[PDB]
A paper describes a structure:
As a result, TcSpdSyn IC50 values for two compounds were determined, with compounds 1 and 2 inhibiting TcSpdSyn at IC50 values of 82.27 and 43.41 μM, respectively. To examine the binding sites used by these two active compounds, we conducted X-ray crystallographic analyses to observe the structures of the TcSpdSyn complex with the two top-ranked compounds (compounds 1 and 2) in the hidden binding pocket, as predicted by the MD simulations. Compound 2 interacts with Glu22 and Asp77, similar to 1, and the lone pair of the quinoline nitrogen atom in 2 is proximal to the carboxylate group of Glu22. Thus, these results suggest that Glu22 is in a neutral state when interacting with the lone pair of quinoline. Compound 2 interacted with Glu22 and Asp77 (interaction energy values: −20.08 and −30.05 kcal/mol, respectively) through two hydrogen bonds in the same manner as 1. In particular, Asp77 interacted with compound 2 in a neutral state. Moreover, some weak interactions, such as with Ile71 Tyr245 and Ile247, were confirmed, with interaction energy values of −7.16, −6.96, and −5.71 kcal/mol, respectively. Comparing the structures of compounds 1 and 2, both are para-substituted anisoles with nitrogen-rich heterocycle para-substituents. However, the X-ray structures display opposite orientations for compounds 1 and 2 at the new site. Compound 1 interacts with Glu22 through the hydroxy group at the meta-position of anisoles, while compound 2 interacts with Glu22 via a secondary amine at para-substituent.
In this study, to demonstrate the utility of virtual screening with protein dynamics, MD simulations were performed on Trypanosoma cruzi spermidine synthase to obtain an ensemble of dominant binding sites with a high probability of existence. The structure of the binding site obtained through MD simulation revealed pockets in addition to the active site that was present in the initial structure. Using the obtained binding site structures, virtual screening of 4.8 million compounds by docking simulation, in vitro assays, and X-ray analysis was conducted, successfully identifying two hit compounds.
Numbering used by the authors:
A (entry chain B): 5 to 170, 176 to 179, 183 to 237, 241 to 294
B (entry chain A): 10 to 170, 183 to 294
The structure:
């Protein structure tokens, strides 16, 4: 339904009476998928955004800002683990998180499971700088439901599980805890302290009560939206807020556009109204 | 009935709010002033825009107000006399006046209509304007500082929409200056140029602090925190807010947030070194 020269409009049920719009230079994809509406377009070349992906009317990836959420999810988790060798990504069909995971020399294998094979296909076509990772021999990329995937995973399979999703069931957290090895780290796309503070409070407590030893929420600075990540440790006495394996000691630190150890530490400082999430 | 905000810096992008009720909409002697009640099912409440750019909403005003007010004052060893340039809504002043060390604050905003419309439509922001420790003037900040004697202020806060040499001059030796600092998203070249312009006018140091706002279509909002005295580290609170009686009244700012605010994404880090 979208056309070139028209505007893409984004609205939110949580924030009614607000809309965010982008001019569409060129439609690249606009169709229902087996699971969701997929919209890819080139935004205004006078603007900074580049190619833009939306799922069910909500922007999920742009060329300009993708490095933020990808670096944060990939490095805050892996740098909190003593030796991450086996990694699971749930969602992340675009490849961004996987690219960041694969920078780490300790990773021998990463499994990626995204329900929507068309997201992965369209990302190969229209976001090669994000999706190149999906071809890596250190990765196995599967089309399937992450819920069923973790249910059929044996105990103690993964060092890190990263949940990079949009959907709504993501019982599941008990499976995640079970498939993690004893030093395990889980991290998730965490929702907004502005939109959904009560949800973060709720999720944080239900994750701890599932049996995770600790859960800390990290905030990120994106150019437009808040977005956070819940970083969960299976093992008691882990402080995920200070990098266990600082990125600065690894050869790729200087390739990163957002993340470093100072950013990692700062991300866990929350505005005072939300600070009770982390204590 | 939707208010739409666009930027020349960000072409092909727009942010819109539904207008529930127009409260004020007229040219002023200096700028277009628009005040509206936004959607009561949304979180924003009353919204003020100047020349088509939103400057204040009931919902988020605490962020920029607390950050400008406290990052500066907690970076000063004993802030007694404070100047605010702009800030006609009263938000920064309200924050500055929480500090017990403050004996007097002058506030100078070019547009008297902004203070009048804030008195009417943002009483929880503009209450401060009536405080006996405050003197409010309607006038240009540039001319005001030009006619201010040397070593008058402990802190100058620039809360707006040669001057800097006058700001440096009117500051006492431990003086702190802070300004509404613009977005590291695209707008980065300007912050870099501002920070160099400020150091070269003779401030000893300039550090940029980032804030987390619920929406900013212009990218991000920050503050440049500048110290007249050499060897001051404005990135670590000199007088922690936690030692003061009003710390728990704050909705955003604390010492953790103060320290964190100066940690910049890698691409922008060269702003602060
Ligand atoms: C695009 S990614 C979000 C953008 C940040 N890279 C969101 C992905 O999660 C997938 N997703 C949603 N639900 C699931 C389940 N249940 N399992 C796996 N992947 C899922 C969905 O297909 C998106 O590609
Ligand atoms: C509303 S405040 C915006 C930030 C939200 N506290 C911006 C104020 O700066 C004033 N302003 C703009 N230029 C000047 C000058 N030159 N002098 C004083 N005040 C000024 C303008 O009238 C706004 O009220
Ligand atoms: C999950 O990682 C993220 C993090 C941030 C975004 N940001 C944006 C959301 C919606 N519309 C936009 C429009 C333009 C730019 C960014 C956005 C999306 C996914
Ligand atoms: C001086 O500091 C600030 C900081 C933040 C804003 N916020 C908003 C700016 C622009 N459009 C919006 C649209 C909707 C909501 C908020 C905003 C203004 C001034």
């Amino acid at each position: 339904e979208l056309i070139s020269g028209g505007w893409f409009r984004e609205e939110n049920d949580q924030w009614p009476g607000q809309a965010m719009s982008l001019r569409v230079e060129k439609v690249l994809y606009d169709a229902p998928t087996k699971f969701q509406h997929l919209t890819i377009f080139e935004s205004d070349p006078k603007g900074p955004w580049g190619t833009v992906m939306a799922l069910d009317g909500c922007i999920q990836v742009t060329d300009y800002d993708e490095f933020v959420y990808h670096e944060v999810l990939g490095h805050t988790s892996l740098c909190s683990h003593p030796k991450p060798e086996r990694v699971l990504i749930i969602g992340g069909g675009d490849g961004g998180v996987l690219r960041e995971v694969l920078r780490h020399g300790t990773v021998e294998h990463c499994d990626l499971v995204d329900i929507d094979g068309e997201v992965m296909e369209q990302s190969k076509q229209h976001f090669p700088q994000i999706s190149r990772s999906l071809a890596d021999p250190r990765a196995t990329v599967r089309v399937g439901d992450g819920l069923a995937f973790v249910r059929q995973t044996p105990d103690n399979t993964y060092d890190v599980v990263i949940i990079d999703t949009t959907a709504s069931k993501l019982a599941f957290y008990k499976d995640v805890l079970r498939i993690l090895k004893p030093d395990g780290i889980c991290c998730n796309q965490g929702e907004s302290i502005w939109l959904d503070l009560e949800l973060i409070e709720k999720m944080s407590r239900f994750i701890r009560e599932t049996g995770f030893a600790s859960v800390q929420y990290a905030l990120m600075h994106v150019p437009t939206y808040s977005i956070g990540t819940l970083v969960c440790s299976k093992k008691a006495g882990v402080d995920v807020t200070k990098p266990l394996r600082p990125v600065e000691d690894m050869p790729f630190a200087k390739d990163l556009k957002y993340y470093d150890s100072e950013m990692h530490k700062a991300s866990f400082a929350l505005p005072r109204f939300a600070r009770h999430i982390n204590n």
